[PDB]
Design a protein around this ligand. Sequence first.
Ligand SMILES: Nc1ncnc2c1ncn2[C@@H]1O[C@@H](COP(=O)(O)O)[C@@H]2O[B@-]3(OCc4ccc([C@H](O)c5ccccc5)cc43)O[C@H]21
Length: 183
Amino acid sequence: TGANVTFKVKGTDKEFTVFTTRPDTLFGATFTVLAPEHELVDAITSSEQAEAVADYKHQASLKSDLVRTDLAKEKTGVWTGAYAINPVNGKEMPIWIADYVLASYGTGAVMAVPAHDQRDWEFAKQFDLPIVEVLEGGNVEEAAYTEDGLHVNSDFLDGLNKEDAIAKIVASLEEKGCGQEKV
Ligand SMILES: Nc1ncnc2c1ncn2[C@@H]1O[C@@H](COP(=O)(O)O)[C@@H]2O[B@-]3(OCc4ccc([C@H](O)c5ccccc5)cc43)O[C@H]21
């Protein structure tokens, strides 16, 4: 039981969809990550970033799934040169490629929530990216908080728990056709 969320690419007519198990953390998504092998990558990569993106894709194709999803391995990646638009508030989120996202699982794209996902937190720490708390109970600057808590910094989701918030955001994204529940 997860959800699909669709993001527009700024300044283009392109879109991608991510698979998320925590659509309730949408207001804490500070960047997005595509698998280096994702089909959209070449289309949205800027000319300044083209060669670095090509180099990283080659490096990534030489690593197995197991090696890539290994928690202990240093996070790596490169900015595509593009930005995604958060449907709930129009906020820009830089689009990165990174090998800890796998092409074959879900859609091959994620929304990164460094405050509440360990791998995303490690990436943000490696690359000096913003970390935004959306569930209280932890100290997200020092460690990802992966448990239940009341929602904050999340507009209409404020004060709800995981169950209630997921139900509300999913129902709200469906209304707009920016997302739906998915198995
Ligand atoms: N292709 C992909 N490669 C790597 N990671 C991917 C991926 N596609 C989706 N993801 C990330 O993992 C899925 C779910 O994994 P699962 O099916 O094993 O439960 C995630 O949904 B996530 O979207 C935003 C989010 C916030 C917080 C978490 C966090 O780890 C969490 C998740 C559940 C309970 C408590 C904490 C996970 C995600 O990151 C995605």
